[PDB]
Amino acid sequence: ICEEPTCRNRTRHLPLQFSRTGPLCPACMKA
């Protein structure tokens, strides 16, 4: 998944905060 216009969308999923970097984004364990 995470090529880093995706990690911009997942640091955006970072304010989906279940995470404080678990795994959002960094910290993505995806590709």
Is 2 marked as a binding-site residue? Answer: yes
Distance CA 30, CA 15 (A): 18
CA distance 30 to 22: 12
C-alpha Rg value of the chain to the nearest Å: 8
**Quick one: tokens of 28?**
């993505």
Q: How many helices (DSSP H) and strands (DSSP E) are in the chain?
A: 1, 0
7 in a known ligand binding site: yes
C-alpha 18: how far from its chain's center?
Answer: 11
Classified as helix, coil or strand, 7 is helix
Q: Which has the closest alpha carbon to 16: 24, 4, 7?
A: 24
Q: Which residue has the tokens 């989906």?
A: 16
- Location of structure tokens 């990690």: 7
Closest residue by Cα to residue 14 from 29, 28, 4: 28
Instruction: Compute the distance between CA of residue 15 and CA of residue 22 in angstroms, rounded to an integer.
Output: 12
Which technique was the structure solved with, according to the deposited record?
NMR
Q: Which residue has the tokens 């279940």?
A: 18
Under DSSP, is residue 23 helix (H, G, I), strand (E, B) or coil? coil
